[PDB]
Amino acid sequence: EKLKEAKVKKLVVKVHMDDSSTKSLMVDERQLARDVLDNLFEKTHCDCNVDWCLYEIYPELQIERVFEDHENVVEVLSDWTRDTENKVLFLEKEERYAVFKNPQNFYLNEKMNAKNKEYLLEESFCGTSIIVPELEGALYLKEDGKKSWKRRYFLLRASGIYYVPKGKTKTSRDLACFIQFENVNIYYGIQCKMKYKAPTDHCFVLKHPQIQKESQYIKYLCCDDARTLSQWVMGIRIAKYGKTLYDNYQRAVARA
């Protein structure tokens, strides 16, 4: 009905570098992380390897995550409060495309060379639907609004995280949905052992992007070890982003 005589929105984004220096970029509302990364590659003449990424820190909630390359940056940043301590960092995070470098570490003509790694990825990502890693095991889930944690068995599925309720079978029928991936972003939890008395500091966090302070809707999961955390974080990102993640990886290689 109406005409769009509006101006394309432009945001000054302060990107923090690993040496503590900053670069102020003009980021318009159409620009993906991919584009801000391309810009930073040109402005820094770095080596352009696939581990370079935008990373958001949440100093209050003590959580951090990688931006995926297809994410709209203005869209992400417009969730932050006026008085926010949150920072966008430009750094290397080699775990971001770990499944793509080493698919055998997540899915479990014989030697696992580049070619067989490629076959595995194509089967897993390039088919009609994505094959999510066969992932299941126990995790510690923080109780809502308590400094206490419950062990429960969880299972990774293409759409979400499932679990067996306390006193139910391991079979298909007994499973209930804990969380859906449409709703949440996945993050690293930092110092949850200290702040929330977590059994370990291998912690991941599940949170709607919009949430900016302490709430029960923020879910805290604690893993037995680093390898477990890695599995869950990689696996969830695969389930959430699917083929887009593969596309992101390929796109990154093209720049290296």
Side-chain angles (χ1 to χ4, degrees), residues 45 58 67 197 224:
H45 299 300
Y58 278 72
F67 279 75
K197 280 172 82 151
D224 288 324

Side-chain angles (χ1 to χ4, degrees), residues 137-155 161-165 176-180 184 192-193 196-200 202-207 215-224 228 232 236:
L139 303 172
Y140 300 96
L141 168 67
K142 193 206 154 298
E143 282 178 304
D144 291 323
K146 286 173 178 177
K147 276 193 190 176
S148 83
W149 297 67
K150 291 294 168 195
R151 202 179 225 221
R152 226 77 78 86
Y153 194 86
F154 292 88
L155 298 98
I161 308 185
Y162 289 75
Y163 70 114
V164 306
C177 184
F178 168 66
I179 213 123
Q180 302 258 263
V184 286
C192 296
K193 184 161 189 120
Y196 289 125
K197 280 172 82 151
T200 67
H202 317 289
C203 175
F204 68 100
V205 180
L206 296 181
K207 187 185 74 66
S215 171
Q216 73 226 247
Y217 284 98
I218 310 179
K219 312 304 211 193
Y220 304 82
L221 286 298
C222 178
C223 304
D224 288 324
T228 297
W232 283 98
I236 291 146

Side-chain angles (χ1 to χ4, degrees), residues 65-83:
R65 77 172 187 115
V66 297
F67 279 75
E68 309 301 347
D69 298 345
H70 73 281
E71 297 193 69
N72 183 291
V73 184
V74 172
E75 192 168 301
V76 174
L77 270 43
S78 58
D79 287 328
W80 294 8
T81 70
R82 292 275 223 86
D83 64 336

Side-chain angles (χ1 to χ4, degrees), residues 11 13 24 26 35 38 43 97 133 150 154 181 191 199 209 214 223 237:
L11 195 62
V13 180
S24 278
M26 203 64 72
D35 295 301
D38 289 359
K43 277 156 171 273
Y97 290 140
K150 291 294 168 195
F154 292 88
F181 294 143
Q191 273 219 296
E214 298 185 332
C223 304
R237 294 168 61 240

